[PDB]
Design a protein around this motif. Structure first.
Motif, PDB file in Angstrom:
ATOM      1  N   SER A   1       7.080  -5.155  -9.221  1.00 28.54           N
ATOM      2  CA  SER A   1       7.159  -4.508  -7.919  1.00 28.54           C
ATOM      3  C   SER A   1       5.773  -4.203  -7.366  1.00 28.54           C
ATOM      4  O   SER A   1       4.762  -4.388  -8.048  1.00 28.54           O
ATOM      5  N   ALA A   2       5.737  -3.719  -6.129  1.00 30.37           N
ATOM      6  CA  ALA A   2       4.495  -3.335  -5.475  1.00 30.37           C
ATOM      7  C   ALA A   2       4.797  -2.350  -4.354  1.00 30.37           C
ATOM      8  O   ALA A   2       5.909  -2.326  -3.834  1.00 30.37           O
ATOM      9  N   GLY A   3       3.816  -1.531  -3.990  1.00 32.37           N
ATOM     10  CA  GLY A   3       3.946  -0.682  -2.821  1.00 32.37           C
ATOM     11  C   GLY A   3       3.298  -1.289  -1.590  1.00 32.37           C
ATOM     12  O   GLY A   3       2.365  -2.084  -1.705  1.00 32.37           O
TER      13      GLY A   3
ATOM     14  N   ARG B   1      -9.422  -2.968  -6.823  1.00 36.45           N
ATOM     15  CA  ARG B   1      -9.883  -1.855  -5.992  1.00 36.45           C
ATOM     16  C   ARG B   1     -10.618  -0.775  -6.777  1.00 36.45           C
ATOM     17  O   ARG B   1     -11.266   0.092  -6.190  1.00 36.45           O
TER      18      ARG B   1
ATOM     19  N   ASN C   1      -4.364   3.209 -10.225  1.00 39.09           N
ATOM     20  CA  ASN C   1      -3.668   4.286  -9.532  1.00 39.09           C
ATOM     21  C   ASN C   1      -2.441   3.802  -8.775  1.00 39.09           C
ATOM     22  O   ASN C   1      -2.434   2.712  -8.203  1.00 39.09           O
ATOM     23  N   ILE C   2      -1.392   4.615  -8.797  1.00 36.85           N
ATOM     24  CA  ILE C   2      -0.256   4.407  -7.916  1.00 36.85           C
ATOM     25  C   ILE C   2      -0.642   4.903  -6.530  1.00 36.85           C
ATOM     26  O   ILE C   2      -1.016   6.063  -6.353  1.00 36.85           O
ATOM     27  N   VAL C   3      -0.561   4.016  -5.550  1.00 37.75           N
ATOM     28  CA  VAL C   3      -0.983   4.351  -4.200  1.00 37.75           C
ATOM     29  C   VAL C   3       0.168   4.960  -3.407  1.00 37.75           C
ATOM     30  O   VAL C   3       1.262   4.389  -3.339  1.00 37.75           O
TER      31      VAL C   3
ATOM     32  N   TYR D   1      -3.625   3.809   0.645  1.00 38.60           N
ATOM     33  CA  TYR D   1      -3.191   3.184   1.910  1.00 38.60           C
ATOM     34  C   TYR D   1      -4.233   2.710   2.938  1.00 38.60           C
ATOM     35  O   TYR D   1      -4.842   1.666   2.743  1.00 38.60           O
TER      36      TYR D   1
ATOM     37  N   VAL E   1      -0.026  -3.280  -2.937  1.00 43.81           N
ATOM     38  CA  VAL E   1      -0.762  -2.782  -4.095  1.00 43.81           C
ATOM     39  C   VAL E   1       0.042  -2.877  -5.395  1.00 43.81           C
ATOM     40  O   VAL E   1       1.252  -2.645  -5.408  1.00 43.81           O
ATOM     41  N   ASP E   2      -0.635  -3.227  -6.485  1.00 46.55           N
ATOM     42  CA  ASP E   2      -0.019  -3.187  -7.807  1.00 46.55           C
ATOM     43  C   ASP E   2      -1.020  -2.714  -8.858  1.00 46.55           C
ATOM     44  O   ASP E   2      -2.181  -2.443  -8.552  1.00 46.55           O
ATOM     45  N   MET E   3      -0.549  -2.560 -10.089  1.00 46.72           N
ATOM     46  CA  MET E   3      -1.410  -2.133 -11.189  1.00 46.72           C
ATOM     47  C   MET E   3      -1.856  -3.181 -12.213  1.00 46.72           C
ATOM     48  O   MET E   3      -2.551  -2.848 -13.171  1.00 46.72           O
TER      49      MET E   3
ATOM     50  N   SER F   1       8.793  -2.052  -3.466  1.00 45.29           N
ATOM     51  CA  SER F   1       9.664  -0.986  -3.945  1.00 45.29           C
ATOM     52  C   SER F   1       9.454   0.361  -3.255  1.00 45.29           C
ATOM     53  O   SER F   1      10.263   1.275  -3.428  1.00 45.29           O
ATOM     54  N   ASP F   2       8.396   0.474  -2.455  1.00 44.04           N
ATOM     55  CA  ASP F   2       7.979   1.769  -1.924  1.00 44.04           C
ATOM     56  C   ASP F   2       6.784   1.661  -0.988  1.00 44.04           C
ATOM     57  O   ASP F   2       6.227   0.583  -0.793  1.00 44.04           O
TER      58      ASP F   2
HETATM   59  N1  LIG Z   1       2.681   2.465  -4.836  1.00 44.66           N
HETATM   60  C1  LIG Z   1       2.342   1.654  -5.843  1.00 44.66           C
HETATM   61  N2  LIG Z   1       1.062   1.646  -6.268  1.00 44.66           N
HETATM   62  C2  LIG Z   1       0.722   0.836  -7.278  1.00 44.66           C
HETATM   63  N3  LIG Z   1       1.489  -0.006  -7.969  1.00 44.66           N
HETATM   64  C3  LIG Z   1       2.756   0.026  -7.523  1.00 44.66           C
HETATM   65  N4  LIG Z   1       3.825  -0.706  -7.988  1.00 44.66           N
HETATM   66  C4  LIG Z   1       4.896  -0.331  -7.226  1.00 44.66           C
HETATM   67  N5  LIG Z   1       4.607   0.569  -6.317  1.00 44.66           N
HETATM   68  C5  LIG Z   1       3.254   0.801  -6.496  1.00 44.66           C
END
Ligand SMILES: Nc1ncnc2[nH]cnc12
Ligand SMILES: Nc1ncnc2[nH]cnc12
Lengths: 205, 199
Positions: A69-71, A89, A131-133, A138, A146-148, A171-172
């Protein structure tokens, strides 16, 4: 592992994922993922080890697929995208005179193009960090999503000479368990990639 | 190859770039070039350690050394690493403690195994960014580098202990002498190994 490898049209594909949460029923039908862990360091350490084991065993994959997933605050929620380019980043050398995102003593641009494009799937630029963004910044992120993990996967794949293909569902970032939809749309994308592999996705001209 | 044998114990020295490596260090060892940043360090060291494991061999200790920034500790001084944290890791929005990696069982701050007499000790934070000026304020560790945590996880994956060593390049209220001090620290560490530190 080596039993997690899937053969599609004479080519050997290796699917990697961060956490078991993203791996659902529809994806379970398609393959068995190597669990890569969470974050750039975990991803880099785990994948570099796996690839090193496989290489000295002559068992090397033709393609590694990083998916999960990714935001995004930019992109439509609950949609799947293939990664056109990835950046890191967490990397800032600018105080000593480097462009932000660029790693010293390494010839790579700040934004690294991924080699492949599969028809029928949207493309998006990606940013990787520990970091979870959320919320604001943003707006401090130039990439679409963004992903990790992915950038760490790339450097691992480049280290052993395997090409990489990303896939990310959103996902968000508009404001979670929507993964049920993410898992189904991700499986649809995987189907299109495997078809593309059979169509000669790995080849010049 | 680049590994040094001391008292029948195998030591592997790893550094980021040429940088902190001078003439005084050169006499002691030839370091592995691990690259810059947590991703470069993790990939390069995991690869090197995997080649060494299947060919094992393997080291009894990995020494991670190079420079570090500090807004707290004196400049031009060398410190062994007491503990290391990953400052880029933030899972807090989904409920994890800030600085803690999900699904790993590790504290936000990871203590390193060994302490060597005659050398100052300090806590370390690692991340992909160069910390400068105002950026020091949110960092709890004594000093900051870009590598060591990545090295730690690489070493833990194959089950090898890690020892950190850091000279202070910048921040540092009030690379020549650092090379000399790292060399003095390395010498004490090797002597410490000859005394059974790796038991
Ligand atoms: N907001 C987010 N930041 C980083 N990795 C994510 N993977 C899914 N949502 C994410
Ligand atoms: N100022 C600094 N910030 C981050 N890592 C460093 N390594 C050496 N000096 C540093």
């Amino acid at each position: 592992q080596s039993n997690a490898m899937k053969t599609v049209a004479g080519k050997r594909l290796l699917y990697v994922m961060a956490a078991d949460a993203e791996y659902g029923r529809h994806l379970a039908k398609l393959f068995t993922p190597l669990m890569i862990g969470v974050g750039p360091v975990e991803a880099a350490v785990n994948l570099a080890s796996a690839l090193a084991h496989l290489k000295l065993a002559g068992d090397m994959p033709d393609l590694v697929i990083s998916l999960g997933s990714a935001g995004s605050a930019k992109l439509p929620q609950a949609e799947v995208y293939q990664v056109s380019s990835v950046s890191y980043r967490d990397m800032d050398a600018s105080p000593i005179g480097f462009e932000k995102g660029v790693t010293p003593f390494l010839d790579l641009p700040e934004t690294v193009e991924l080699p492949f494009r599969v028809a029928g799937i949207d493309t998006a630029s990606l940013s990787t960090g520990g970091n979870i963004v959320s919320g604001k910044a943003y707006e401090r992120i130039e990439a679409d999503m963004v992903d990790m993990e992915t950038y760490a996967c790339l450097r691992a794949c480049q280290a052993v000479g395997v090409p990489l293909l990303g896939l990310r569902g959103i996902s968000d970032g508009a404001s979670t368990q929507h993964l049920h939809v993410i898992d189904e749309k991700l499986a649809g994308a995987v189907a299109r990639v495997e078809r593309a592999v059979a169509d000669g996705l790995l080849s010049p001209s």
